[PDB]
Amino acid sequence: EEYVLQAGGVLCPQPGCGMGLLVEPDCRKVTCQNGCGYVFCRNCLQGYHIGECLPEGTGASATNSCEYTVDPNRAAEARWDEASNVTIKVSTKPCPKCRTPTERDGGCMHMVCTRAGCGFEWCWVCQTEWTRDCMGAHWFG
Ligand SMILES: [Zn+2]
Ligand SMILES: [Zn+2]
Ligand SMILES: [Zn+2]
Ligand SMILES: [Zn+2]
């Protein structure tokens, strides 16, 4: 560090002085050692102090001051009802062979048992086995 510079100076605040005070950047002690020697501040006439200071007022009336915390809820309820009343009907008649529920086909008066292990045809109007008696006399809708 070898650079010649200068910092902000000040003057003796005495009405009978004003000779001039030279304040070095690394100097923290202002005193009229050349005249009416008394210690004061470089920014104010507080008689020297440590900290901040600004001439003609700092311009600080307020800043920040607020402390308050709130609690949440996170509490709720949940419900649901599935259903009520179940009416079941029967549209099927038991097969004469496998006894499986055979349903009718609207539009035709013939119904055959379509079952994996059956395949038994019978008359809808008069339920009987497919024979010569009712070979389909009225097998037409
Ligand atoms: Zn002085
Ligand atoms: Zn000061
Ligand atoms: Zn059957
Ligand atoms: Zn018949």
Side-chain angles (χ1 to χ4, degrees):
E1 291 181 82
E2 45 186 81
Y3 189 93
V4 55
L5 45 74
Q6 65 284 329
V10 72
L11 278 82
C12 188
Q14 191 188 91
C17 196
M19 298 180 310
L21 277 302
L22 199 289
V23 183
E24 290 292 80
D26 187 46
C27 180
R28 55 269 287 166
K29 187 91 293 180
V30 58
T31 302
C32 206
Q33 301 180 331
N34 189 30
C36 30
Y38 64 89
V39 189
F40 57 108
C41 192
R42 53 170 293 168
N43 299 329
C44 46
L45 276 55
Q46 294 301 272
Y48 189 89
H49 67 110
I50 302 298
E52 296 301 279
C53 46
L54 207 161
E56 299 182 84
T58 51
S61 183
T63 310
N64 290 92
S65 187
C66 53
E67 192 60 79
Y68 193 82
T69 177
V70 289
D71 288 282
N73 293 270
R74 297 175 58 224
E77 302 177 87
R79 62 169 295 173
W80 170 251
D81 284 76
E82 184 175 89
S84 191
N85 181 87
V86 181
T87 310
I88 305 178
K89 300 184 64 179
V90 56
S91 49
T92 48
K93 267 60 185 179
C95 172
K97 191 277 175 56
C98 54
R99 298 291 296 181
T100 55
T102 301
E103 189 172 70
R104 82 297 297 259
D105 281 78
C108 52
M109 51 189 57
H110 67 264
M111 56 150 50
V112 309
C113 182
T114 49
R115 205 276 183 137
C118 188
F120 189 82
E121 314 91 325
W122 47 292
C123 186
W124 156 257
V125 185
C126 41
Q127 49 178 90
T128 38
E129 57 176 287
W130 196 62
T131 41
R132 299 295 299 265
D133 177 67
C134 194
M135 194 176 65
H138 41 247
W139 202 268
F140 55 95

Short mmCIF file of all heavy atoms in Angstrom, two decimals, residues 41-95:
data_model
loop_
_atom_site.label_atom_id
_atom_site.label_comp_id
_atom_site.label_asym_id
_atom_site.label_seq_id
_atom_site.Cartn_x
_atom_site.Cartn_y
_atom_site.Cartn_z
N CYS A 41 -16.43 15.07 17.97
CA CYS A 41 -16.61 14.10 16.92
C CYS A 41 -16.34 14.76 15.59
O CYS A 41 -16.33 15.97 15.49
CB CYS A 41 -18.01 13.49 16.96
SG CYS A 41 -18.21 12.02 15.89
N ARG A 42 -16.11 13.97 14.57
CA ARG A 42 -15.82 14.53 13.27
C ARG A 42 -17.10 14.82 12.50
O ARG A 42 -17.10 15.59 11.55
CB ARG A 42 -14.92 13.58 12.46
CG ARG A 42 -15.46 12.17 12.36
CD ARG A 42 -14.65 11.36 11.36
NE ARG A 42 -14.84 11.86 10.00
CZ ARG A 42 -14.08 11.50 8.95
NH1 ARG A 42 -13.09 10.64 9.11
NH2 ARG A 42 -14.33 12.01 7.75
N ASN A 43 -18.18 14.18 12.91
CA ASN A 43 -19.45 14.36 12.25
C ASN A 43 -20.37 15.22 13.10
O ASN A 43 -21.26 15.89 12.58
CB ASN A 43 -20.10 13.01 11.96
CG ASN A 43 -19.27 12.14 11.03
OD1 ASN A 43 -18.54 12.64 10.17
ND2 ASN A 43 -19.36 10.84 11.21
N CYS A 44 -20.14 15.18 14.40
CA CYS A 44 -20.97 15.92 15.34
C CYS A 44 -20.13 16.52 16.46
O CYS A 44 -18.94 16.33 16.53
CB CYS A 44 -22.06 15.01 15.91
SG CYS A 44 -21.48 13.38 16.47
N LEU A 45 -20.78 17.23 17.35
CA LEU A 45 -20.10 17.88 18.45
C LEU A 45 -20.41 17.17 19.76
O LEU A 45 -20.41 17.77 20.83
CB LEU A 45 -20.55 19.34 18.55
CG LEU A 45 -19.83 20.36 17.65
CD1 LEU A 45 -19.86 19.94 16.18
CD2 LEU A 45 -20.45 21.73 17.82
N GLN A 46 -20.62 15.86 19.67
CA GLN A 46 -20.97 15.05 20.84
C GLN A 46 -19.78 14.88 21.80
O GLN A 46 -19.92 14.28 22.86
CB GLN A 46 -21.47 13.68 20.40
CG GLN A 46 -22.79 13.71 19.64
CD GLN A 46 -23.91 14.32 20.46
OE1 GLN A 46 -24.59 13.63 21.21
NE2 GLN A 46 -24.12 15.62 20.29
N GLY A 47 -18.63 15.42 21.44
CA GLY A 47 -17.47 15.28 22.28
C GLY A 47 -16.80 13.96 22.03
O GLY A 47 -16.15 13.40 22.92
N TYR A 48 -16.98 13.46 20.80
CA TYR A 48 -16.44 12.19 20.34
C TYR A 48 -17.24 11.01 20.88
O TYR A 48 -17.64 11.00 22.04
CB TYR A 48 -14.95 12.04 20.67
CG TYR A 48 -14.31 10.84 20.03
CD1 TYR A 48 -13.75 10.93 18.76
CD2 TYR A 48 -14.28 9.61 20.67
CE1 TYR A 48 -13.19 9.83 18.16
CE2 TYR A 48 -13.72 8.50 20.08
CZ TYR A 48 -13.17 8.62 18.82
OH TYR A 48 -12.62 7.51 18.21
N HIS A 49 -17.47 10.04 20.02
CA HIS A 49 -18.18 8.83 20.39
C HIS A 49 -17.87 7.75 19.37
O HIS A 49 -17.18 8.00 18.38
CB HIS A 49 -19.70 9.07 20.47
CG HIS A 49 -20.34 9.38 19.15
ND1 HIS A 49 -21.20 8.52 18.50
CD2 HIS A 49 -20.23 10.47 18.36
CE1 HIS A 49 -21.57 9.09 17.35
NE2 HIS A 49 -21.00 10.29 17.21
N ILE A 50 -18.38 6.56 19.60
CA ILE A 50 -18.19 5.47 18.66
C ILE A 50 -19.54 5.08 18.07
O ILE A 50 -20.52 4.92 18.80
CB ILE A 50 -17.54 4.24 19.34
CG1 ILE A 50 -16.19 4.61 19.97
CG2 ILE A 50 -17.38 3.10 18.34
CD1 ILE A 50 -15.15 5.10 18.97
N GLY A 51 -19.59 4.94 16.76
CA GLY A 51 -20.82 4.55 16.12
C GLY A 51 -21.18 5.47 14.97
O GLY A 51 -20.31 6.13 14.40
N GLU A 52 -22.45 5.51 14.64
CA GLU A 52 -22.92 6.33 13.54
C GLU A 52 -23.31 7.72 14.00
O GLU A 52 -23.59 7.95 15.18
CB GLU A 52 -24.10 5.68 12.84
CG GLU A 52 -23.78 4.36 12.18
CD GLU A 52 -22.69 4.48 11.14
OE1 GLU A 52 -22.99 4.89 10.00
OE2 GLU A 52 -21.53 4.14 11.45
N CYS A 53 -23.33 8.62 13.04
CA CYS A 53 -23.72 10.00 13.26
C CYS A 53 -23.76 10.75 11.95
O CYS A 53 -22.96 10.48 11.05
CB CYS A 53 -22.81 10.71 14.25
SG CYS A 53 -21.02 10.45 13.98
N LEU A 54 -24.67 11.66 11.85
CA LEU A 54 -24.85 12.43 10.66
C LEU A 54 -25.21 13.85 11.04
O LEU A 54 -26.10 14.06 11.88
CB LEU A 54 -25.95 11.77 9.83
CG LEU A 54 -25.90 11.98 8.32
CD1 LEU A 54 -26.75 10.92 7.65
CD2 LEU A 54 -26.40 13.35 7.95
N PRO A 55 -24.53 14.85 10.47
CA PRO A 55 -24.80 16.25 10.76
C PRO A 55 -26.14 16.69 10.20
O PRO A 55 -26.64 16.12 9.23
CB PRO A 55 -23.66 16.99 10.06
CG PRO A 55 -23.29 16.08 8.94
CD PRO A 55 -23.44 14.69 9.49
N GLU A 56 -26.72 17.71 10.82
CA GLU A 56 -28.03 18.24 10.42
C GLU A 56 -29.15 17.20 10.61
O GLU A 56 -30.22 17.31 10.01
CB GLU A 56 -28.00 18.73 8.97
CG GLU A 56 -27.02 19.86 8.72
CD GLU A 56 -27.06 20.34 7.30
OE1 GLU A 56 -27.92 21.19 6.98
OE2 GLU A 56 -26.23 19.89 6.49
N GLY A 57 -28.89 16.21 11.46
CA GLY A 57 -29.88 15.18 11.71
C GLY A 57 -29.64 13.94 10.88
O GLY A 57 -29.22 14.03 9.73
N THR A 58 -29.91 12.78 11.46
CA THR A 58 -29.72 11.52 10.76
C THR A 58 -30.86 11.24 9.79
O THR A 58 -30.69 10.51 8.81
CB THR A 58 -29.61 10.36 11.76
OG1 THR A 58 -30.71 10.41 12.68
CG2 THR A 58 -28.30 10.42 12.53
N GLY A 59 -32.01 11.83 10.07
CA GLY A 59 -33.16 11.63 9.22
C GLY A 59 -33.80 10.28 9.45
O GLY A 59 -34.34 9.67 8.53
N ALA A 60 -33.73 9.81 10.68
CA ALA A 60 -34.31 8.53 11.04
C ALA A 60 -35.31 8.70 12.17
O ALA A 60 -34.93 8.97 13.31
CB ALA A 60 -33.22 7.55 11.44
N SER A 61 -36.58 8.58 11.84
CA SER A 61 -37.64 8.73 12.82
C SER A 61 -38.13 7.36 13.28
O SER A 61 -38.47 7.16 14.44
CB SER A 61 -38.79 9.54 12.22
OG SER A 61 -39.82 9.75 13.17
N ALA A 62 -38.14 6.41 12.35
CA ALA A 62 -38.57 5.06 12.64
C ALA A 62 -37.91 4.10 11.67
O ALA A 62 -37.17 4.53 10.78
CB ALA A 62 -40.09 4.95 12.53
N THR A 63 -38.13 2.82 11.84
CA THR A 63 -37.56 1.83 10.95
C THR A 63 -38.48 0.61 10.82
O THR A 63 -39.35 0.58 9.95
CB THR A 63 -36.14 1.40 11.40
OG1 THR A 63 -35.34 2.57 11.64
CG2 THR A 63 -35.47 0.55 10.33
N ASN A 64 -38.32 -0.37 11.70
CA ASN A 64 -39.14 -1.58 11.65
C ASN A 64 -39.39 -2.13 13.04
O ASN A 64 -38.48 -2.18 13.88
CB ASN A 64 -38.48 -2.67 10.79
CG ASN A 64 -38.48 -2.34 9.31
OD1 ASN A 64 -37.54 -1.77 8.78
ND2 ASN A 64 -39.56 -2.70 8.63
N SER A 65 -40.62 -2.53 13.29
CA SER A 65 -41.02 -3.09 14.56
C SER A 65 -42.39 -3.76 14.43
O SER A 65 -43.42 -3.08 14.47
CB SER A 65 -41.04 -2.02 15.66
OG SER A 65 -41.26 -2.59 16.94
N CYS A 66 -42.38 -5.06 14.23
CA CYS A 66 -43.60 -5.83 14.09
C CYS A 66 -43.33 -7.31 14.37
O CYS A 66 -42.46 -7.92 13.74
CB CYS A 66 -44.19 -5.66 12.68
SG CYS A 66 -43.02 -6.00 11.34
N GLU A 67 -44.05 -7.87 15.33
CA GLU A 67 -43.88 -9.26 15.69
C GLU A 67 -45.24 -9.89 15.99
O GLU A 67 -45.90 -9.51 16.96
CB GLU A 67 -42.97 -9.38 16.91
CG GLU A 67 -42.50 -10.80 17.20
CD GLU A 67 -41.72 -11.39 16.05
OE1 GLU A 67 -40.52 -11.06 15.91
OE2 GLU A 67 -42.29 -12.18 15.28
N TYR A 68 -45.67 -10.82 15.16
CA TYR A 68 -46.94 -11.49 15.35
C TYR A 68 -47.01 -12.77 14.52
O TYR A 68 -46.70 -12.76 13.33
CB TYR A 68 -48.10 -10.55 14.98
CG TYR A 68 -49.46 -11.04 15.44
CD1 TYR A 68 -49.88 -10.82 16.74
CD2 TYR A 68 -50.31 -11.71 14.57
CE1 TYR A 68 -51.12 -11.26 17.17
CE2 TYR A 68 -51.54 -12.16 15.00
CZ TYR A 68 -51.94 -11.93 16.29
OH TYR A 68 -53.18 -12.38 16.72
N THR A 69 -47.41 -13.85 15.16
CA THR A 69 -47.53 -15.13 14.48
C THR A 69 -48.93 -15.71 14.69
O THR A 69 -49.55 -15.51 15.74
CB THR A 69 -46.45 -16.14 14.96
OG1 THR A 69 -46.63 -17.42 14.34
CG2 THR A 69 -46.47 -16.30 16.48
N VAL A 70 -49.44 -16.41 13.69
CA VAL A 70 -50.77 -16.99 13.76
C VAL A 70 -50.73 -18.51 13.59
O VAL A 70 -49.77 -19.06 13.04
CB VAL A 70 -51.70 -16.39 12.68
CG1 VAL A 70 -52.06 -14.95 13.02
CG2 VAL A 70 -51.05 -16.45 11.30
N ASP A 71 -51.77 -19.17 14.07
CA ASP A 71 -51.89 -20.62 13.95
C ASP A 71 -52.88 -20.99 12.86
O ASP A 71 -53.87 -20.28 12.66
CB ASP A 71 -52.34 -21.26 15.28
CG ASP A 71 -51.28 -21.25 16.34
OD1 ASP A 71 -50.36 -22.10 16.29
OD2 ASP A 71 -51.36 -20.40 17.26
N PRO A 72 -52.63 -22.08 12.14
CA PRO A 72 -53.52 -22.55 11.09
C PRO A 72 -54.63 -23.45 11.65
O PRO A 72 -54.84 -23.52 12.87
CB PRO A 72 -52.58 -23.37 10.20
CG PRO A 72 -51.58 -23.94 11.15
CD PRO A 72 -51.44 -22.95 12.28
N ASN A 73 -55.35 -24.13 10.77
CA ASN A 73 -56.42 -25.02 11.18
C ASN A 73 -56.11 -26.46 10.78
O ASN A 73 -55.81 -27.29 11.64
CB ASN A 73 -57.76 -24.59 10.57
CG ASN A 73 -58.25 -23.26 11.12
OD1 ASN A 73 -58.96 -23.20 12.12
ND2 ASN A 73 -57.88 -22.17 10.46
N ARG A 74 -56.16 -26.74 9.47
CA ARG A 74 -55.85 -28.07 8.93
C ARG A 74 -56.81 -29.14 9.47
O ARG A 74 -56.46 -30.32 9.55
CB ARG A 74 -54.40 -28.46 9.24
CG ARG A 74 -53.36 -27.56 8.59
CD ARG A 74 -51.96 -27.93 9.04
NE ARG A 74 -51.63 -29.32 8.73
CZ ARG A 74 -51.01 -30.16 9.57
NH1 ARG A 74 -50.65 -29.75 10.78
NH2 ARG A 74 -50.75 -31.40 9.19
N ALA A 75 -58.02 -28.74 9.82
CA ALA A 75 -58.99 -29.67 10.37
C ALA A 75 -60.27 -29.67 9.55
O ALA A 75 -60.95 -28.65 9.45
CB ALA A 75 -59.28 -29.34 11.82
N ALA A 76 -60.59 -30.81 8.96
CA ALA A 76 -61.78 -30.94 8.15
C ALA A 76 -62.35 -32.34 8.29
O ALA A 76 -61.69 -33.24 8.81
CB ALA A 76 -61.48 -30.63 6.70
N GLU A 77 -63.57 -32.53 7.82
CA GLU A 77 -64.24 -33.82 7.90
C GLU A 77 -64.64 -34.30 6.52
O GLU A 77 -64.82 -33.50 5.60
CB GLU A 77 -65.47 -33.71 8.79
CG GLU A 77 -65.16 -33.23 10.20
CD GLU A 77 -66.41 -33.06 11.03
OE1 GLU A 77 -66.85 -34.04 11.64
OE2 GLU A 77 -66.95 -31.93 11.06
N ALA A 78 -64.78 -35.61 6.38
CA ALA A 78 -65.17 -36.21 5.11
C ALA A 78 -66.01 -37.46 5.34
O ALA A 78 -65.67 -38.30 6.18
CB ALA A 78 -63.93 -36.54 4.29
N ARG A 79 -67.11 -37.56 4.62
CA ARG A 79 -67.99 -38.72 4.71
C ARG A 79 -68.68 -38.96 3.38
O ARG A 79 -68.68 -38.09 2.51
CB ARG A 79 -69.03 -38.53 5.82
CG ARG A 79 -69.98 -37.37 5.60
CD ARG A 79 -71.14 -37.40 6.57
NE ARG A 79 -72.00 -38.57 6.36
CZ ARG A 79 -73.02 -38.92 7.15
NH1 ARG A 79 -73.28 -38.22 8.25
NH2 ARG A 79 -73.76 -39.99 6.85
N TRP A 80 -69.28 -40.14 3.24
CA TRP A 80 -69.98 -40.51 2.01
C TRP A 80 -70.79 -41.78 2.21
O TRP A 80 -70.29 -42.77 2.74
CB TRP A 80 -68.98 -40.70 0.86
CG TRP A 80 -69.58 -41.31 -0.36
CD1 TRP A 80 -69.36 -42.56 -0.84
CD2 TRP A 80 -70.53 -40.71 -1.26
NE1 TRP A 80 -70.09 -42.78 -1.98
CE2 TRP A 80 -70.82 -41.65 -2.25
CE3 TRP A 80 -71.15 -39.46 -1.31
CZ2 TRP A 80 -71.70 -41.39 -3.29
CZ3 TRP A 80 -72.03 -39.20 -2.34
CH2 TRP A 80 -72.30 -40.17 -3.32
N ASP A 81 -72.04 -41.74 1.79
CA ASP A 81 -72.91 -42.90 1.86
C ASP A 81 -73.09 -43.48 0.47
O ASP A 81 -73.39 -42.76 -0.49
CB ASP A 81 -74.26 -42.54 2.49
CG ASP A 81 -74.16 -42.38 4.00
OD1 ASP A 81 -73.64 -41.35 4.47
OD2 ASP A 81 -74.59 -43.31 4.72
N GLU A 82 -72.91 -44.79 0.36
CA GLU A 82 -72.92 -45.48 -0.92
C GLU A 82 -74.29 -45.44 -1.59
O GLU A 82 -74.46 -44.77 -2.60
CB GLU A 82 -72.44 -46.92 -0.74
CG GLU A 82 -72.33 -47.69 -2.04
CD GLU A 82 -71.75 -49.07 -1.84
OE1 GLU A 82 -72.51 -50.01 -1.58
OE2 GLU A 82 -70.51 -49.21 -1.95
N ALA A 83 -75.25 -46.16 -1.03
CA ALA A 83 -76.59 -46.22 -1.61
C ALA A 83 -77.57 -46.90 -0.66
O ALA A 83 -77.19 -47.36 0.41
CB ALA A 83 -76.55 -46.95 -2.95
N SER A 84 -78.83 -46.95 -1.07
CA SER A 84 -79.86 -47.58 -0.26
C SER A 84 -80.93 -48.18 -1.17
O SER A 84 -81.22 -47.63 -2.24
CB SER A 84 -80.47 -46.56 0.70
OG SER A 84 -81.31 -47.19 1.66
N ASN A 85 -81.50 -49.31 -0.73
CA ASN A 85 -82.57 -50.02 -1.45
C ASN A 85 -82.05 -50.72 -2.71
O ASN A 85 -81.55 -50.08 -3.63
CB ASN A 85 -83.75 -49.08 -1.80
CG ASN A 85 -84.88 -49.80 -2.52
OD1 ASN A 85 -85.76 -50.37 -1.89
ND2 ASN A 85 -84.87 -49.76 -3.84
N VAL A 86 -82.17 -52.04 -2.72
CA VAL A 86 -81.75 -52.85 -3.86
C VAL A 86 -82.87 -53.80 -4.26
O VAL A 86 -83.15 -54.78 -3.57
CB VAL A 86 -80.48 -53.68 -3.54
CG1 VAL A 86 -80.05 -54.49 -4.76
CG2 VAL A 86 -79.34 -52.79 -3.08
N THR A 87 -83.52 -53.51 -5.37
CA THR A 87 -84.59 -54.34 -5.87
C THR A 87 -84.08 -55.22 -7.01
O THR A 87 -83.62 -54.72 -8.04
CB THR A 87 -85.77 -53.48 -6.37
OG1 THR A 87 -86.12 -52.52 -5.37
CG2 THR A 87 -86.98 -54.35 -6.68
N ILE A 88 -84.15 -56.53 -6.83
CA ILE A 88 -83.68 -57.47 -7.84
C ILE A 88 -84.86 -58.21 -8.46
O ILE A 88 -85.80 -58.60 -7.76
CB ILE A 88 -82.67 -58.49 -7.24
CG1 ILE A 88 -81.51 -57.75 -6.55
CG2 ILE A 88 -82.14 -59.42 -8.33
CD1 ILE A 88 -80.50 -58.67 -5.90
N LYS A 89 -84.81 -58.40 -9.76
CA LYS A 89 -85.87 -59.09 -10.48
C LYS A 89 -85.33 -60.32 -11.18
O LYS A 89 -84.12 -60.44 -11.43
CB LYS A 89 -86.53 -58.17 -11.50
CG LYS A 89 -87.15 -56.91 -10.91
CD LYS A 89 -87.86 -56.08 -11.97
CE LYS A 89 -89.04 -56.83 -12.56
NZ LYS A 89 -89.76 -56.02 -13.58
N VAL A 90 -86.21 -61.24 -11.51
CA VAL A 90 -85.84 -62.45 -12.22
C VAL A 90 -86.53 -62.49 -13.59
O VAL A 90 -87.76 -62.38 -13.68
CB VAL A 90 -86.16 -63.73 -11.40
CG1 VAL A 90 -87.63 -63.80 -11.01
CG2 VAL A 90 -85.74 -64.98 -12.17
N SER A 91 -85.75 -62.61 -14.64
CA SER A 91 -86.28 -62.63 -15.99
C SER A 91 -85.97 -63.97 -16.67
O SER A 91 -86.38 -64.22 -17.81
CB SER A 91 -85.66 -61.48 -16.79
OG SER A 91 -84.25 -61.47 -16.64
N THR A 92 -85.26 -64.82 -15.96
CA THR A 92 -84.83 -66.08 -16.51
C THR A 92 -85.63 -67.27 -15.96
O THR A 92 -86.11 -67.25 -14.83
CB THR A 92 -83.35 -66.30 -16.20
OG1 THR A 92 -83.11 -66.04 -14.81
CG2 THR A 92 -82.48 -65.39 -17.04
N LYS A 93 -85.77 -68.28 -16.79
CA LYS A 93 -86.37 -69.55 -16.41
C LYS A 93 -85.32 -70.64 -16.46
O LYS A 93 -84.46 -70.63 -17.34
CB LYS A 93 -87.57 -69.91 -17.32
CG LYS A 93 -88.94 -69.45 -16.81
CD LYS A 93 -89.05 -67.95 -16.62
CE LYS A 93 -90.40 -67.59 -16.00
NZ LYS A 93 -90.56 -66.13 -15.79
N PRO A 94 -85.34 -71.58 -15.51
CA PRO A 94 -84.35 -72.66 -15.45
C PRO A 94 -84.48 -73.64 -16.62
O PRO A 94 -85.57 -74.13 -16.93
CB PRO A 94 -84.68 -73.36 -14.13
CG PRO A 94 -86.11 -73.05 -13.87
CD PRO A 94 -86.33 -71.67 -14.42
N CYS A 95 -83.35 -73.91 -17.27
CA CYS A 95 -83.29 -74.87 -18.37
C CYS A 95 -83.74 -76.24 -17.91
O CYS A 95 -83.42 -76.67 -16.81
CB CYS A 95 -81.85 -74.94 -18.93
SG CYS A 95 -81.58 -76.26 -20.16
#
